[PDB]
Design brief:
InterPro entries: Arrestin-like_C (IPR014752), Vps26-related (IPR028934). With 283 residues, the protein is mostly beta strands. The protein has two domains: 146 residues, Immunoglobulin-like (Sandwich); 137 residues, Immunoglobulin-like (Sandwich). The chain contains no helices and 23 strands. Strands 2, 3, 6, 7, 10, 11 and 12 form a seven-stranded mixed sheet that branches. Strands 13, 16, 18, 19, 21, 22 and 23 form a seven-stranded mixed sheet that branches. The protein has a four-stranded antiparallel sheet with strand order 14-15-17-20, with no helix packed on it. β22 and β23 form a beta hairpin. The two termini are 44 Å apart.
Length: 283
């Protein structure tokens, strides 16, 4: 019947960004920042040159929403712009409709998680008696930040095991290098195994319940039994990372931790973790 296309102005002049979809594929989408105008045209193409198409209105929407997987039908839209493009009538010929949303709120970064998703899109809808012809084009949003000593964390019993991990920042951008050192200051118990992890914690809070998903992004092992310091360098740019996302519209958080892990000879596990705020540096 109809083929609806959504075409952005300055299409081939604007930046695209890679973003992983719920499946696992990484597609490229038009990248927008907070505030930016979103404009273009909704293109209608009559499959049958020779045939009207009746409708109860054509409209374009800019929507920003949070979708919780434990409540999948119930979208939480945080920004909705609606611009009606046509009154009910009929299309008797392929044609396009201009649209512009000036000043578009996009407070949060796009996120495709484990129990939750935050996406922006344009939706063009042709209302009809039977079923609406609906067309959605996702667009991706990024949030840039700008920022400016030593941070320490330690693990193990009292007299018999004291390990100290020291690193340069409490904040890192997504291409940064975590520069630190492991100090073995006391080792009366044999150490069977030790590692530094970077962990992504996704916290989704849907209804009375909160769900929690830990994802180990990077696992850096500390070798062979002769524990002196050992310098640590974790290269963030090698990993799939997103900025820290704190309490996004009180629906979910994505936070990152350095997780110090120590397994002794009696097989006792010693854990310590500390939050590092990730952020996106503007290119």
């Amino acid at each position: 019947s109809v083929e609806v296309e959504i075409l952005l102005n300055d299409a081939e002049s604007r930046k695209r960004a890679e973003h992983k979809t719920e499946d696992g594929k990484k597609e490229k989408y038009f990248l927008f920042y907070d505030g930016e105008t979103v404009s273009g045209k909704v293109s209608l193409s009559l499959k049958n040159p020779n045939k009207r198409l009746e409708h109860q209105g054509i409209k374009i929407e800019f929507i920003g929403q949070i979708e919780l997987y434990y409540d999948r039908g119930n979208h939480h839209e945080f920004v909705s712009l609606v611009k009606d493009l046509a009154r009910p009538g009929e299309i008797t010929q392929s044609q396009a409709f201009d649209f512009e949303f000036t000043h578009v709120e996009k407070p949060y970064e796009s996120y495709t998680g484990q129990n939750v998703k935050l996406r922006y899109f344009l939706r063009a809808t042709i209302s009809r008696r039977l079923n609406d012809v609906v067309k959605e084009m996702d667009i991706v949003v990024h949030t840039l930040s700008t920022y400016p000593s030593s941070i320490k964390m330690e693990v193990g019993i009292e007299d018999c095991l004291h390990i100290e991990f020291e690193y340069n920042k409490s904040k890192y951008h997504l291409k940064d290098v975590i520069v630190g050192k492991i100090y073995f200051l006391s080792v009366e118990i044999k150490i069977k195994h030790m590692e530094i992890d970077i962990i992504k914690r996704e916290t989704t809070g849907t209804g009375p319940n909160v769900y929690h998903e830990n994802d180990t992004i990077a696992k850096y092992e500390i070798m062979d039994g002769a524990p002196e310091s050992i310098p640590i360098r974790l290269f963030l740019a090698g990993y799939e990372l997103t900025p820290t996302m704190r309490d996004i519209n009180k629906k979910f958080s994505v936070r990152y931790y350095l997780n110090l892990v120590l397994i002794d000879e009696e097989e006792r596990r010693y854990f310590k973790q500390q939050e590092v705020v990730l952020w996106r540096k503007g290119d």
